[PDB]
């Protein structure tokens, strides 16, 4: 049951800035690692760490990165000055034995997105679509469709909540979101999700259905000079009650 | 120094056996690792192969090793939809650093027992004028193609498993800003089956 | 000199080969301040404490089933492998010796004299040195310095014979080594 | 028929000295230069027929360094009993005037693996042509070392080999001269 944990899930940073990626490797593990995977690229090694010292490093490492072991829990990777190319999934790993003959336990990953200007960041617009009456009679089932639109970058964690509790059965979300303007390079994204329940379940008006979308944007320390609202890390939701008809 | 895996993506039908290769250096071998990496989850180790020719089994997943030739074969006997993940292989030399391959993205197409294809219209919970089109209950053989127009948005087929009543459904969502868009002409761009039901 | 106290940790991995890779025995040895604390023996199959100090280590290392199964297979993955890597230049190494015969001190005939046969710069250390008076071997009055390891993949030995040389006598040193098919012979006339 | 390959490693404190080497029947196959992080083959021929990843050794030394701290604390800071060496000076082949030869200094049966070795031609230290082996293993867990001096034998010239070790109060000086 022990796991390598990483916070946050996603991260946005302006080009040139210093980024500290936090990791909590398994308590009794002797070797700690850092790996990264650029979109449409292999998972590449960055650094291995044993007994308060770097064991192995990359040619790219040292010039661009540094590692620190402060407390007997945390292990961190530092990006000196962020480049547009540093946008990747950052994996923190750790292995039990000092002989390396054992498996490496991987963290969930931290999707880092480096942008030239934070002016292109937008939170999602969540909306829930009620099932069709034609579906209720034909299949004897009811499909609820959620829609998260106009968000940039792809820093979205969709979740379905039935009666105040998170659900996984009959739930499916798109693995990749679609671009709203496929011609543009810095185009905003759109993502859809489905929740199928029994016709009698949706027909009960006591039953509550909510689609939660966690967005990873800006922080209160980041400078915002634009007219529009600050696109900060926020939760945008949309709800619907059961309809008897 | 260099590890390759082929293919980058692989689609296989539910219940069908599947295999994928991993090519690694033929010299200085210490260990070969296999990781199962699911979407939004952490890559988890399946096998850590250290002995040449030694076969390892973890459920329906078998792995063989040939250190002399520099290859490794992973086999999924009677593949289930839960096996849909990216399978990565890594080569470990004298150190602790792993040299990863491209990884074979496995997508297990579900067996749709009794398919009932249809296109339904969904009303927004807050607005009556806002709607969404849903192409659902079509078998795994039917594919959903992208929209020709920039104002109409169509998502790819997504498999939902209603764990309770033991049911699997394929679904696709479509919406447009321009009101001159209807369900009957929404999914017309794709090869829609003849049995597809349309309401009113 | 340097009065400061020293603390030494020594690690040894012994690969014992009997008739090539036919019979192999691995011996993982942990040594603290010249005293062996704990060891892994492939014949035993698990870590065993030599002294009291090694007791917590034999316990902990035997608890790790990964490391334990890794170590049991090491006779093939590590021992047998490393043998094959070196075999051509290590096992099959053959260096021909330079044989020289000279008296200890120039002494007249019918008087006591010591003859010296110097066998040098050869590999491996297995060498057969025999002394001959006039076709027949002289087993008595022979003194050897023993086999000397030079440290540069060469060996050397000096074999002496106590003699009372006479007019007709033609002494000869016979050297048998795997580098040569036929025995090496260097003769000295009285 | 009977051969032995030994992967011999050590770490020593407070000196912070570590060595890794492979031994085939008493002869060093190769060693790892910790400072240069490179494999050093005893005979240049070996580097042409075999390879070695220096990292494997560097990883092992890191563990040895940690293991030493653990054992130092466990023994309640009990230090190593000094064992003085047995120095022996000899030649590569029989000595012959104006014919190039090699003087060999064999420092043997000692612990810890720290020694100050000086070749002395006519009382003055010599460095030209000098080569040396690493700390070689012994069945009794002591150390072996070899020091080499290429030279041309002369009746006028005299050689010595000064060897300093904490096991001995006064440095061992082994003389050599033509007779």
């Amino acid at each position: 049951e022990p796991e390598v944990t990483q916070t946050p899930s996603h991260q946005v940073t302006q080009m040139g800035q210093e980024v500290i990626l936090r990791c909590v490797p398994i308590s009794n593990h002797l070797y700690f690692y850092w790996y990264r995977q650029i979109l449409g690229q292999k998972v590449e090694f960055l650094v291995s760490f044993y007994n308060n010292e770097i064991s192995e490093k990359s040619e790219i490492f040292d010039d661009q990165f540094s590692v620190e072991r402060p407390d007997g829990s945390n292990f961190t990777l530092k990006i000196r000055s962020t480049k547009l190319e540093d946008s990747a999934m950052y994996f923190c790993a750790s292995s039990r034995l000092a002989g390396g003959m054992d498996e490496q336990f991987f963290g969930p990953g931290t999707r880092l997105t480096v942008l030239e200007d934070l002016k292109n960041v937008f939170p999602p617009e969540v909306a829930v679509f009620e099932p069709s009456e034609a579906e209720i009679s034909h299949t004897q089932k009811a499909t609820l469709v959620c829609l998260a639109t106009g968000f940039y970058p792809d820093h979205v964690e969709l979740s379905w909540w039935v009666n105040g509790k998170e659900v996984h059965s009959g739930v499916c979300t798109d693995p990749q979101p679609l671009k709203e303007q496929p011609a543009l390079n810095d185009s905003r994204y759109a993502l859809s999700s489905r929740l199928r329940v029994s016709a009698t379940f949706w027909q009960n008006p006591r039953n509550h259905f909510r689609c939660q979308v966690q967005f990873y944007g800006l922080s209160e320390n980041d400078e915002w000079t634009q007219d529009r609202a600050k696109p900060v890390t926020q939760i945008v939701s949309a709800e619907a009650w059961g309809r008897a008809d | 120094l260099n590890v390759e895996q082929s293919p980058q993506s692989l689609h296989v039908q539910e219940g069908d056996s599947t295999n994928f290769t991993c090519s690694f250096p033929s010299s200085n071998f210490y260990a070969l690792h296999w990781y199962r990496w699911e979407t939004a989850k952490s890559p988890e180790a399946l096998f850590v192969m250290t002995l040449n020719g030694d076969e390892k089994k973890k459920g329906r997943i078998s792995a063989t090793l040939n250190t002399k030739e520099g290859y490794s074969y992973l086999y999924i006997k009677g593949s289930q939809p839960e096996d849909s993940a990216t399978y990565l292989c890594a080569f470990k030399a004298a150190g602790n650093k792993l040299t990863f391959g491209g990884g074979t993205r496995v997508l297990v197409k579900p067996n749709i027992q009794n398919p009932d294809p249809a296109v339904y219209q969904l009303r927004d919970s807050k607005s009556s004028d806002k709607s969404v089109c849903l192409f659902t209950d079509f078998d795994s053989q039917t594919n959903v193609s992208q929209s020709k127009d920039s104002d109409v948005y169509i998502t790819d087929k997504c498999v939902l498993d209603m764990r309770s009543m033991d049911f699997k459904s394929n679904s696709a969502v479509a919406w447009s800003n321009k009101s001159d868009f209807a369900c009957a002409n929404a999914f017309n761009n794709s090869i829609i089956p003849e049995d597809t039901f349309f309401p009113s | 000199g340097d009065t400061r106290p020293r603390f030494l940790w020594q690690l040894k991995f012994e690969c014992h080969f009997f008739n090539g890779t036919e019979r192999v025995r691995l011996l993982e040895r942990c040594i603290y301040n010249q005293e062996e604390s704990v060891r892994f023996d492939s014949d035993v199959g698990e870590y065993r404490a030599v002294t009291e100090l090694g007791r917590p280590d034999a316990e902990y290392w035997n608890s790790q089933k990964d490391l334990l199964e890794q170590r049991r297979a090491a006779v093939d993955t590590y021992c047998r492998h490393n043998y094959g890597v070196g075999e051509s230049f290590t096992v099959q190494r053959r260096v021909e010796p330079k044989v020289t015969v000279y008296p200890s001190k120039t002494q007249p005939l019918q008087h006591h004299n010591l003859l010296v046969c110097s066998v040098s710069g050869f590999y491996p250390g297995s060498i057969e040195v025999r002394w001959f008076r006039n076709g027949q071997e002289e087993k008595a009055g022979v003194v050897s310095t023993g086999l000397i390891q030079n440290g540069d993949w060469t060996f050397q030995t000096l074999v002496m014979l106590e003699t009372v040389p006479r007019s007709g006598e033609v002494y000869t040193c016979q050297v048998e080594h795997p580098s040569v098919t036929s025995p090496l012979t260097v003769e000295w006339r009285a | 028929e009977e051969h032995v390959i030994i992967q011999a490693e050590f770490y020593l404190n407070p000196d912070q000295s570590g060595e890794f080497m492979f031994d085939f029947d008493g002869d060093e196959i190769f060693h790892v230069d910790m400072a240069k992080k490179e494999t050093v083959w005893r005979l240049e021929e070996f580097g042409r027929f075999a390879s070695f990843e220096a990292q494997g050794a560097l990883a092992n030394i890191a563990v040895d360094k940690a293991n030493l701290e653990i054992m130092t604390k466990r023994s309640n800071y009990t230090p190593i009993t000094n064992v003085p060496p047995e120095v022996t000076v000899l030649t590569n082949s029989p000595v012959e005037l104006r014919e190039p030869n090699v003087l060999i200094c064999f420092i043997d049966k000692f612990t810890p693996p720290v020694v100050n070795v000086t070749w002395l031609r006519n009382g003055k230290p010599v460095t030209t042509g000098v080569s040396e082996t690493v700390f070689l293993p012994r069945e009794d867990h002591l150390f072996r070392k070899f020091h080499y001096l290429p030279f041309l034998p002369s009746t006028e010239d005299v050689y010595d080999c000064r060897v300093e070790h904490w096991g001995l109060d006064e440095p061992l000086l082994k003389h050599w001269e033509f007779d």
Partner: peptide
């Protein structure tokens, strides 16, 4: 062909 290192393991603490 490469010479292999039998990897050292850390002692009990």
């Amino acid at each position: 062909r490469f010479y292999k290192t039998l990897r050292a393991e850390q002692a009990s603490q």
